[PDB]
Amino acid sequence: CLAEGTRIFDPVTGTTHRIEDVVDGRKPIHVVAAAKDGTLHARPVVSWFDQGTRDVIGLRIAGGAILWATPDHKVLTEYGWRAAGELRKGDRVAVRDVETGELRYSVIREVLPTRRARTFDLEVEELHTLVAEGVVVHACSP
């Protein structure tokens, strides 16, 4: 799950949303989703999950964004899919380049300890991924 405050870019409208507003309002946004070949595409959110209050860890990424996610949340990395809690400083995560909109990889500059937050998931049609704070993460069915 992803923490309250996680920013989700809608590539169709160009609007960035906080995930808790998307879920609490059942907003029919699109996200940027990754296909397995590294191409990025617009896909609609089809389900909205309130996952309750959980520990989230922080992954501070080159560029300055911090992804706050539960340790078990799957993140796309240079290795493949990995649980956020297994990632370490120096591992490289898949990101959407904010200027070009294409997929690239960025280094984790720091892993931050847990804090307690409301957490959320979205189900993204067909591709089951989304870009959250610039990072490609899992956005799957229950």
Side-chain angles (χ1 to χ4, degrees), residues 39-101:
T39 54
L40 301 183
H41 311 271
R43 288 290 181 279
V45 173
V46 294
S47 309
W48 305 260
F49 306 103
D50 186 336
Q51 310 288 39
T53 287
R54 311 189 175 207
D55 281 344
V56 294
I57 58 170
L59 306 178
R60 180 164 62 88
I61 314 299
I66 304 178
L67 174 68
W68 288 100
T70 61
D72 71 310
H73 200 95
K74 302 285 239 220
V75 181
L76 182 61
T77 80
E78 64 181 307
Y79 313 109
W81 289 102
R82 298 289 185 278
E86 300 298 304
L87 297 183
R88 299 294 182 259
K89 179 191 288 184
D91 290 335
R92 293 185 300 139
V93 298
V95 301
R96 173 184 178 269
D97 187 274
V98 75
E99 292 293 329
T100 70

Short mmCIF file of all heavy atoms in Angstrom, two decimals, residues 39-101:
data_model
loop_
_atom_site.label_atom_id
_atom_site.label_comp_id
_atom_site.label_asym_id
_atom_site.label_seq_id
_atom_site.Cartn_x
_atom_site.Cartn_y
_atom_site.Cartn_z
N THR A 39 7.60 0.46 -21.98
CA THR A 39 6.84 1.59 -22.48
C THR A 39 5.79 2.01 -21.45
O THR A 39 5.29 1.20 -20.66
CB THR A 39 6.15 1.27 -23.81
OG1 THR A 39 5.37 0.07 -23.68
CG2 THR A 39 7.19 1.11 -24.93
N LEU A 40 5.49 3.30 -21.45
CA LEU A 40 4.55 3.90 -20.52
C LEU A 40 3.28 4.32 -21.26
O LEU A 40 3.34 4.76 -22.41
CB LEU A 40 5.16 5.12 -19.83
CG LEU A 40 6.43 4.83 -19.02
CD1 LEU A 40 6.89 6.10 -18.32
CD2 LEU A 40 6.14 3.73 -18.00
N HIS A 41 2.13 4.17 -20.59
CA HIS A 41 0.82 4.36 -21.21
C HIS A 41 -0.17 4.91 -20.19
O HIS A 41 -0.03 4.69 -19.00
CB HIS A 41 0.25 3.04 -21.74
CG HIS A 41 1.21 2.28 -22.57
ND1 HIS A 41 1.33 2.45 -23.93
CD2 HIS A 41 2.17 1.39 -22.22
CE1 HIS A 41 2.29 1.67 -24.39
NE2 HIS A 41 2.81 1.01 -23.37
N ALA A 42 -1.19 5.59 -20.68
CA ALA A 42 -2.26 6.04 -19.82
C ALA A 42 -3.27 4.92 -19.60
O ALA A 42 -3.76 4.33 -20.57
CB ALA A 42 -2.94 7.26 -20.43
N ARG A 43 -3.61 4.65 -18.34
CA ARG A 43 -4.60 3.62 -18.04
C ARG A 43 -5.52 4.08 -16.91
O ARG A 43 -5.07 4.76 -15.98
CB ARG A 43 -3.95 2.28 -17.66
CG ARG A 43 -3.29 1.52 -18.84
CD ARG A 43 -4.35 0.98 -19.81
NE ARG A 43 -3.74 0.24 -20.92
CZ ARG A 43 -3.22 0.79 -22.01
NH1 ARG A 43 -3.20 2.11 -22.16
NH2 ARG A 43 -2.70 0.02 -22.96
N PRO A 44 -6.79 3.70 -16.95
CA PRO A 44 -7.72 4.16 -15.91
C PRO A 44 -7.64 3.35 -14.62
O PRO A 44 -7.41 2.14 -14.62
CB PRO A 44 -9.09 3.97 -16.57
CG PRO A 44 -8.89 2.76 -17.44
CD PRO A 44 -7.48 2.93 -18.00
N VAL A 45 -7.85 4.06 -13.52
CA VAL A 45 -8.11 3.41 -12.24
C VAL A 45 -9.49 2.79 -12.27
O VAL A 45 -10.47 3.44 -12.68
CB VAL A 45 -7.98 4.42 -11.10
CG1 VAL A 45 -8.41 3.79 -9.76
CG2 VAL A 45 -6.56 4.90 -11.00
N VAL A 46 -9.59 1.53 -11.86
CA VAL A 46 -10.87 0.83 -11.86
C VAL A 46 -11.32 0.40 -10.48
O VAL A 46 -12.50 0.05 -10.32
CB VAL A 46 -10.86 -0.38 -12.81
CG1 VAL A 46 -10.71 0.11 -14.23
CG2 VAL A 46 -9.74 -1.33 -12.45
N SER A 47 -10.44 0.40 -9.49
CA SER A 47 -10.82 0.11 -8.12
C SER A 47 -10.02 1.00 -7.19
O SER A 47 -8.90 1.41 -7.49
CB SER A 47 -10.59 -1.37 -7.74
OG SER A 47 -11.17 -2.26 -8.67
N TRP A 48 -10.63 1.29 -6.03
CA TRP A 48 -10.08 2.20 -5.04
C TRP A 48 -10.08 1.48 -3.69
O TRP A 48 -11.14 1.04 -3.23
CB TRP A 48 -10.92 3.48 -4.95
CG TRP A 48 -11.10 4.18 -6.27
CD1 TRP A 48 -10.40 5.27 -6.71
CD2 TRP A 48 -12.04 3.85 -7.31
NE1 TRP A 48 -10.84 5.63 -7.97
CE2 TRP A 48 -11.85 4.78 -8.35
CE3 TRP A 48 -13.01 2.86 -7.47
CZ2 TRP A 48 -12.58 4.75 -9.54
CZ3 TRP A 48 -13.76 2.83 -8.64
CH2 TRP A 48 -13.54 3.77 -9.66
N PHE A 49 -8.91 1.36 -3.07
CA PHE A 49 -8.79 0.63 -1.81
C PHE A 49 -8.26 1.53 -0.71
O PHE A 49 -7.21 2.17 -0.85
CB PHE A 49 -7.90 -0.59 -1.96
CG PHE A 49 -8.32 -1.50 -3.07
CD1 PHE A 49 -7.64 -1.52 -4.27
CD2 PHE A 49 -9.41 -2.33 -2.91
CE1 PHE A 49 -8.06 -2.35 -5.30
CE2 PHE A 49 -9.83 -3.16 -3.93
CZ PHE A 49 -9.14 -3.17 -5.12
N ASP A 50 -9.00 1.56 0.39
CA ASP A 50 -8.54 2.10 1.66
C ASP A 50 -7.97 0.93 2.46
O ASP A 50 -8.72 0.04 2.89
CB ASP A 50 -9.72 2.77 2.37
CG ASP A 50 -9.32 3.49 3.64
OD1 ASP A 50 -8.28 3.15 4.26
OD2 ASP A 50 -10.05 4.43 4.00
N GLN A 51 -6.66 0.92 2.66
CA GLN A 51 -6.00 -0.20 3.31
C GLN A 51 -5.71 0.06 4.78
O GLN A 51 -5.01 -0.74 5.41
CB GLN A 51 -4.71 -0.55 2.57
CG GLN A 51 -4.89 -0.71 1.04
CD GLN A 51 -5.64 -1.98 0.66
OE1 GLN A 51 -6.60 -2.39 1.31
NE2 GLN A 51 -5.18 -2.62 -0.42
N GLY A 52 -6.24 1.14 5.35
CA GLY A 52 -6.13 1.38 6.77
C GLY A 52 -4.78 1.95 7.15
O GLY A 52 -3.98 2.34 6.32
N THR A 53 -4.53 1.97 8.46
CA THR A 53 -3.32 2.59 8.99
C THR A 53 -2.22 1.54 9.14
O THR A 53 -2.43 0.50 9.77
CB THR A 53 -3.59 3.28 10.32
OG1 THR A 53 -4.35 4.47 10.09
CG2 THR A 53 -2.30 3.65 10.99
N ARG A 54 -1.05 1.83 8.58
CA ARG A 54 0.04 0.87 8.51
C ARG A 54 1.35 1.62 8.65
O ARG A 54 1.42 2.84 8.47
CB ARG A 54 0.05 0.09 7.18
CG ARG A 54 -1.28 -0.49 6.79
CD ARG A 54 -1.19 -1.44 5.60
NE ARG A 54 -2.50 -2.03 5.38
CZ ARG A 54 -2.71 -3.22 4.83
NH1 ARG A 54 -1.68 -3.96 4.44
NH2 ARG A 54 -3.96 -3.67 4.67
N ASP A 55 2.40 0.86 8.95
CA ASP A 55 3.75 1.38 8.82
C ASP A 55 4.11 1.53 7.35
O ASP A 55 3.88 0.63 6.54
CB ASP A 55 4.76 0.46 9.48
CG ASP A 55 4.80 0.60 10.99
OD1 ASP A 55 4.28 1.61 11.53
OD2 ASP A 55 5.34 -0.32 11.62
N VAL A 56 4.70 2.67 7.02
CA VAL A 56 5.28 2.88 5.71
C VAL A 56 6.74 3.28 5.88
O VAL A 56 7.10 4.01 6.81
CB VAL A 56 4.51 3.93 4.88
CG1 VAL A 56 3.10 3.41 4.54
CG2 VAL A 56 4.46 5.27 5.60
N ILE A 57 7.59 2.78 4.98
CA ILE A 57 8.98 3.18 4.91
C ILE A 57 9.14 4.20 3.80
O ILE A 57 8.25 4.38 2.95
CB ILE A 57 9.93 1.98 4.68
CG1 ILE A 57 9.56 1.24 3.40
CG2 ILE A 57 9.85 1.02 5.86
CD1 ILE A 57 10.58 0.21 3.01
N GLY A 58 10.28 4.89 3.81
CA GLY A 58 10.48 5.90 2.78
C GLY A 58 11.66 5.62 1.88
O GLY A 58 12.74 5.28 2.35
N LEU A 59 11.47 5.74 0.58
CA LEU A 59 12.57 5.59 -0.38
C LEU A 59 12.82 6.96 -0.99
O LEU A 59 12.00 7.45 -1.77
CB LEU A 59 12.24 4.55 -1.45
CG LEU A 59 11.82 3.15 -1.00
CD1 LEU A 59 11.47 2.24 -2.16
CD2 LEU A 59 12.89 2.50 -0.14
N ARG A 60 13.94 7.58 -0.62
CA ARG A 60 14.31 8.86 -1.19
C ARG A 60 15.12 8.60 -2.45
O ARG A 60 16.14 7.91 -2.39
CB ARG A 60 15.12 9.71 -0.20
CG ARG A 60 15.51 11.05 -0.77
CD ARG A 60 15.95 12.04 0.29
NE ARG A 60 17.13 11.61 1.04
CZ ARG A 60 18.38 11.86 0.66
NH1 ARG A 60 18.61 12.53 -0.47
NH2 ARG A 60 19.40 11.45 1.40
N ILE A 61 14.65 9.18 -3.55
CA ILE A 61 15.09 8.88 -4.92
C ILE A 61 15.91 10.06 -5.41
O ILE A 61 15.67 11.21 -5.02
CB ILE A 61 13.87 8.64 -5.84
CG1 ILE A 61 12.85 7.70 -5.18
CG2 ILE A 61 14.29 8.09 -7.18
CD1 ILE A 61 13.42 6.33 -4.87
N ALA A 62 16.89 9.79 -6.27
CA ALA A 62 17.56 10.89 -6.97
C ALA A 62 16.52 11.80 -7.62
O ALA A 62 15.56 11.33 -8.25
CB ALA A 62 18.53 10.34 -8.01
N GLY A 63 16.71 13.10 -7.47
CA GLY A 63 15.72 14.09 -7.83
C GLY A 63 14.98 14.68 -6.65
O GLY A 63 14.44 15.79 -6.77
N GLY A 64 14.92 13.97 -5.53
CA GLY A 64 14.39 14.51 -4.29
C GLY A 64 13.05 13.96 -3.86
O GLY A 64 12.62 14.23 -2.73
N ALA A 65 12.37 13.20 -4.71
CA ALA A 65 11.10 12.64 -4.30
C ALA A 65 11.32 11.54 -3.27
O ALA A 65 12.36 10.87 -3.26
CB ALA A 65 10.33 12.08 -5.50
N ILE A 66 10.34 11.39 -2.38
CA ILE A 66 10.33 10.30 -1.42
C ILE A 66 9.05 9.52 -1.61
O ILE A 66 7.95 10.07 -1.47
CB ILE A 66 10.43 10.80 0.03
CG1 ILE A 66 11.69 11.66 0.22
CG2 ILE A 66 10.46 9.60 0.97
CD1 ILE A 66 11.83 12.23 1.65
N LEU A 67 9.19 8.23 -1.93
CA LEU A 67 8.06 7.32 -2.03
C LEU A 67 7.83 6.69 -0.66
O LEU A 67 8.75 6.09 -0.10
CB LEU A 67 8.34 6.23 -3.07
CG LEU A 67 7.29 5.12 -3.17
CD1 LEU A 67 5.99 5.69 -3.73
CD2 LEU A 67 7.78 3.96 -4.01
N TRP A 68 6.62 6.84 -0.12
CA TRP A 68 6.26 6.28 1.18
C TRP A 68 5.33 5.11 0.94
O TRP A 68 4.21 5.30 0.44
CB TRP A 68 5.61 7.34 2.07
CG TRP A 68 6.57 8.37 2.59
CD1 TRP A 68 6.76 9.64 2.11
CD2 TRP A 68 7.48 8.23 3.70
NE1 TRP A 68 7.73 10.29 2.84
CE2 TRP A 68 8.17 9.45 3.84
CE3 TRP A 68 7.75 7.19 4.60
CZ2 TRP A 68 9.14 9.66 4.82
CZ3 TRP A 68 8.70 7.40 5.59
CH2 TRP A 68 9.39 8.62 5.69
N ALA A 69 5.78 3.90 1.26
CA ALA A 69 5.01 2.71 0.92
C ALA A 69 5.22 1.65 1.99
O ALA A 69 6.22 1.66 2.71
CB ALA A 69 5.40 2.14 -0.45
N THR A 70 4.27 0.72 2.10
CA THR A 70 4.45 -0.38 3.04
C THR A 70 5.64 -1.23 2.61
O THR A 70 5.97 -1.30 1.41
CB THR A 70 3.20 -1.24 3.16
OG1 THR A 70 2.85 -1.83 1.89
CG2 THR A 70 2.04 -0.41 3.68
N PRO A 71 6.34 -1.86 3.56
CA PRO A 71 7.51 -2.67 3.17
C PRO A 71 7.19 -3.76 2.16
O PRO A 71 8.07 -4.14 1.37
CB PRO A 71 8.01 -3.26 4.50
CG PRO A 71 7.42 -2.40 5.57
CD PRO A 71 6.16 -1.80 5.02
N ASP A 72 5.96 -4.24 2.11
CA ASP A 72 5.62 -5.31 1.18
C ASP A 72 5.17 -4.80 -0.18
O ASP A 72 4.90 -5.62 -1.06
CB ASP A 72 4.53 -6.20 1.77
CG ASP A 72 3.19 -5.51 1.80
OD1 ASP A 72 3.13 -4.36 2.29
OD2 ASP A 72 2.21 -6.10 1.31
N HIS A 73 5.09 -3.49 -0.39
CA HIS A 73 4.61 -2.99 -1.68
C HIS A 73 5.65 -3.24 -2.77
O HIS A 73 6.84 -2.97 -2.59
CB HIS A 73 4.31 -1.50 -1.63
CG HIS A 73 3.40 -1.06 -2.73
ND1 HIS A 73 2.04 -0.95 -2.56
CD2 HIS A 73 3.65 -0.75 -4.03
CE1 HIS A 73 1.48 -0.57 -3.70
NE2 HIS A 73 2.44 -0.45 -4.61
N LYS A 74 5.18 -3.73 -3.92
CA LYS A 74 6.10 -4.07 -5.00
C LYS A 74 6.47 -2.84 -5.82
O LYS A 74 5.60 -2.09 -6.27
CB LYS A 74 5.49 -5.15 -5.89
CG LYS A 74 5.12 -6.41 -5.14
CD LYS A 74 6.35 -7.22 -4.80
CE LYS A 74 6.23 -8.60 -5.42
NZ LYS A 74 6.71 -9.67 -4.52
N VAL A 75 7.77 -2.67 -6.03
CA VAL A 75 8.38 -1.56 -6.76
C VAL A 75 9.14 -2.15 -7.94
O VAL A 75 9.82 -3.17 -7.79
CB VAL A 75 9.33 -0.76 -5.84
CG1 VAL A 75 9.94 0.42 -6.60
CG2 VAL A 75 8.60 -0.29 -4.56
N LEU A 76 9.02 -1.54 -9.11
CA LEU A 76 9.78 -2.00 -10.26
C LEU A 76 11.21 -1.49 -10.17
O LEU A 76 11.44 -0.29 -10.00
CB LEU A 76 9.13 -1.54 -11.56
CG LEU A 76 9.85 -2.04 -12.81
CD1 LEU A 76 9.85 -3.56 -12.86
CD2 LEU A 76 9.20 -1.48 -14.07
N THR A 77 12.18 -2.41 -10.27
CA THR A 77 13.58 -2.05 -10.10
C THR A 77 14.41 -2.57 -11.27
O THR A 77 13.93 -3.33 -12.12
CB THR A 77 14.17 -2.61 -8.81
OG1 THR A 77 14.51 -3.99 -9.01
CG2 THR A 77 13.19 -2.47 -7.64
N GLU A 78 15.69 -2.20 -11.23
CA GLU A 78 16.65 -2.69 -12.21
C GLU A 78 16.75 -4.21 -12.21
O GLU A 78 17.25 -4.79 -13.19
CB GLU A 78 18.03 -2.10 -11.93
CG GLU A 78 18.61 -2.53 -10.58
CD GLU A 78 19.97 -1.92 -10.29
OE1 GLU A 78 20.87 -2.04 -11.13
OE2 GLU A 78 20.13 -1.30 -9.21
N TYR A 79 16.30 -4.85 -11.12
CA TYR A 79 16.29 -6.30 -10.90
C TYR A 79 15.00 -6.97 -11.37
O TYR A 79 15.00 -8.19 -11.59
CB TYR A 79 16.44 -6.63 -9.41
CG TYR A 79 17.54 -5.89 -8.67
CD1 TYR A 79 17.23 -4.91 -7.73
CD2 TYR A 79 18.87 -6.20 -8.89
CE1 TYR A 79 18.23 -4.24 -7.06
CE2 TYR A 79 19.88 -5.53 -8.22
CZ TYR A 79 19.55 -4.55 -7.30
OH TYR A 79 20.56 -3.89 -6.64
N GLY A 80 13.92 -6.21 -11.52
CA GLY A 80 12.58 -6.73 -11.57
C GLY A 80 11.78 -6.20 -10.40
O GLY A 80 12.18 -5.25 -9.72
N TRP A 81 10.64 -6.83 -10.16
CA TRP A 81 9.77 -6.42 -9.06
C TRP A 81 10.39 -6.81 -7.73
O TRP A 81 10.81 -7.96 -7.55
CB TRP A 81 8.39 -7.05 -9.22
CG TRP A 81 7.63 -6.46 -10.37
CD1 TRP A 81 7.44 -7.00 -11.61
CD2 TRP A 81 6.97 -5.19 -10.38
NE1 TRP A 81 6.70 -6.14 -12.39
CE2 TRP A 81 6.40 -5.02 -11.65
CE3 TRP A 81 6.80 -4.18 -9.42
CZ2 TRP A 81 5.67 -3.88 -11.99
CZ3 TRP A 81 6.09 -3.05 -9.75
CH2 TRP A 81 5.52 -2.91 -11.03
N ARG A 82 10.46 -5.86 -6.80
CA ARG A 82 11.00 -6.10 -5.47
C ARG A 82 10.13 -5.43 -4.42
O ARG A 82 9.61 -4.34 -4.64
CB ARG A 82 12.44 -5.59 -5.33
CG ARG A 82 13.44 -6.25 -6.27
CD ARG A 82 13.67 -7.68 -5.80
NE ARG A 82 14.71 -8.39 -6.55
CZ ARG A 82 14.51 -8.98 -7.72
NH1 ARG A 82 13.32 -8.93 -8.31
NH2 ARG A 82 15.51 -9.61 -8.32
N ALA A 83 10.01 -6.08 -3.26
CA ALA A 83 9.32 -5.46 -2.14
C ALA A 83 10.08 -4.22 -1.68
O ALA A 83 11.31 -4.24 -1.55
CB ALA A 83 9.19 -6.46 -0.99
N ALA A 84 9.35 -3.15 -1.39
CA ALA A 84 10.00 -1.90 -1.01
C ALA A 84 10.93 -2.10 0.17
O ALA A 84 12.01 -1.51 0.23
CB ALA A 84 8.97 -0.82 -0.66
N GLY A 85 10.52 -2.94 1.12
CA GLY A 85 11.30 -3.18 2.32
C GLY A 85 12.60 -3.94 2.09
O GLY A 85 13.44 -3.98 3.00
N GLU A 86 12.78 -4.54 0.91
CA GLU A 86 14.03 -5.21 0.60
C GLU A 86 15.02 -4.29 -0.11
O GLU A 86 16.19 -4.67 -0.26
CB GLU A 86 13.78 -6.45 -0.27
CG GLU A 86 12.88 -7.49 0.37
CD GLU A 86 13.46 -8.06 1.65
OE1 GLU A 86 14.60 -8.57 1.61
OE2 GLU A 86 12.78 -7.99 2.70
N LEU A 87 14.59 -3.11 -0.53
CA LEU A 87 15.45 -2.20 -1.27
C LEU A 87 16.40 -1.47 -0.33
O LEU A 87 16.12 -1.26 0.86
CB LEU A 87 14.62 -1.21 -2.09
CG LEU A 87 13.78 -1.95 -3.13
CD1 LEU A 87 13.03 -0.94 -3.98
CD2 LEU A 87 14.69 -2.84 -3.98
N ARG A 88 17.56 -1.11 -0.87
CA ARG A 88 18.62 -0.49 -0.08
C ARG A 88 19.17 0.68 -0.86
O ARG A 88 19.03 0.75 -2.08
CB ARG A 88 19.76 -1.49 0.23
CG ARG A 88 19.32 -2.69 1.04
CD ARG A 88 18.88 -2.29 2.46
NE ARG A 88 18.50 -3.46 3.26
CZ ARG A 88 17.24 -3.84 3.49
NH1 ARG A 88 16.22 -3.15 3.00
NH2 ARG A 88 17.01 -4.92 4.24
N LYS A 89 19.83 1.60 -0.15
CA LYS A 89 20.57 2.68 -0.78
C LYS A 89 21.44 2.13 -1.91
O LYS A 89 22.18 1.15 -1.72
CB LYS A 89 21.45 3.38 0.26
CG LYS A 89 22.31 4.53 -0.29
CD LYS A 89 23.35 5.02 0.73
CE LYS A 89 22.74 5.79 1.88
NZ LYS A 89 23.82 6.32 2.79
N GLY A 90 21.35 2.75 -3.08
CA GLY A 90 22.12 2.33 -4.24
C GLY A 90 21.35 1.46 -5.22
O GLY A 90 21.77 1.35 -6.38
N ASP A 91 20.27 0.82 -4.78
CA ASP A 91 19.40 0.14 -5.73
C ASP A 91 18.73 1.16 -6.64
O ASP A 91 18.51 2.31 -6.27
CB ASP A 91 18.32 -0.68 -5.01
CG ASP A 91 18.88 -1.90 -4.29
OD1 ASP A 91 19.95 -2.41 -4.69
OD2 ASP A 91 18.23 -2.36 -3.32
N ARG A 92 18.40 0.72 -7.85
CA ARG A 92 17.85 1.61 -8.86
C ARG A 92 16.41 1.21 -9.16
O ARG A 92 16.13 0.04 -9.43
CB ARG A 92 18.71 1.56 -10.12
CG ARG A 92 20.11 2.15 -9.89
CD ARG A 92 20.88 2.20 -11.18
NE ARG A 92 21.02 0.86 -11.72
CZ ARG A 92 20.89 0.56 -13.00
NH1 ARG A 92 20.60 1.51 -13.88
NH2 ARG A 92 21.03 -0.70 -13.40
N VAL A 93 15.49 2.18 -9.06
CA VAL A 93 14.07 1.94 -9.30
C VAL A 93 13.68 2.54 -10.65
O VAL A 93 14.27 3.52 -11.13
CB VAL A 93 13.20 2.52 -8.16
CG1 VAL A 93 13.51 1.83 -6.83
CG2 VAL A 93 13.40 4.02 -8.06
N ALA A 94 12.64 1.95 -11.25
CA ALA A 94 12.11 2.48 -12.50
C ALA A 94 11.29 3.73 -12.20
O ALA A 94 10.52 3.76 -11.24
CB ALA A 94 11.25 1.43 -13.19
N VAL A 95 11.50 4.78 -13.00
CA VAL A 95 10.84 6.07 -12.84
C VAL A 95 10.34 6.55 -14.18
O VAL A 95 10.81 6.14 -15.25
CB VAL A 95 11.77 7.14 -12.22
CG1 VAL A 95 12.29 6.69 -10.84
CG2 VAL A 95 12.91 7.46 -13.19
N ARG A 96 9.37 7.46 -14.12
CA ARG A 96 8.97 8.24 -15.28
C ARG A 96 9.79 9.53 -15.30
O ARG A 96 9.73 10.31 -14.34
CB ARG A 96 7.47 8.55 -15.24
CG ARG A 96 6.98 9.50 -16.32
CD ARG A 96 5.49 9.81 -16.12
NE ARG A 96 5.04 10.77 -17.13
CZ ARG A 96 5.06 12.09 -16.97
NH1 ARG A 96 5.52 12.63 -15.85
NH2 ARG A 96 4.66 12.88 -17.96
N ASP A 97 10.54 9.75 -16.36
CA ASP A 97 11.27 11.00 -16.46
C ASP A 97 10.27 12.15 -16.55
O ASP A 97 9.43 12.17 -17.45
CB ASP A 97 12.20 11.00 -17.67
CG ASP A 97 13.09 12.22 -17.69
OD1 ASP A 97 12.66 13.26 -18.21
OD2 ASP A 97 14.22 12.15 -17.15
N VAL A 98 10.36 13.09 -15.61
CA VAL A 98 9.33 14.12 -15.51
C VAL A 98 9.36 15.10 -16.67
O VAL A 98 8.35 15.76 -16.96
CB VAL A 98 9.47 14.85 -14.16
CG1 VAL A 98 10.66 15.81 -14.18
CG2 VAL A 98 8.18 15.56 -13.79
N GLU A 99 10.49 15.22 -17.36
CA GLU A 99 10.59 16.11 -18.51
C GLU A 99 10.23 15.40 -19.81
O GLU A 99 9.60 16.00 -20.69
CB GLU A 99 11.99 16.71 -18.60
CG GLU A 99 12.32 17.68 -17.47
CD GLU A 99 11.49 18.96 -17.52
OE1 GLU A 99 11.12 19.41 -18.63
OE2 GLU A 99 11.21 19.51 -16.43
N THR A 100 10.60 14.13 -19.96
CA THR A 100 10.38 13.42 -21.22
C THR A 100 9.18 12.47 -21.20
O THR A 100 8.68 12.13 -22.27
CB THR A 100 11.64 12.62 -21.61
OG1 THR A 100 11.82 11.51 -20.72
CG2 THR A 100 12.88 13.51 -21.56
N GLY A 101 8.72 12.05 -20.02
CA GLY A 101 7.63 11.09 -19.95
C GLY A 101 8.00 9.66 -20.27
O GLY A 101 7.10 8.81 -20.36
#
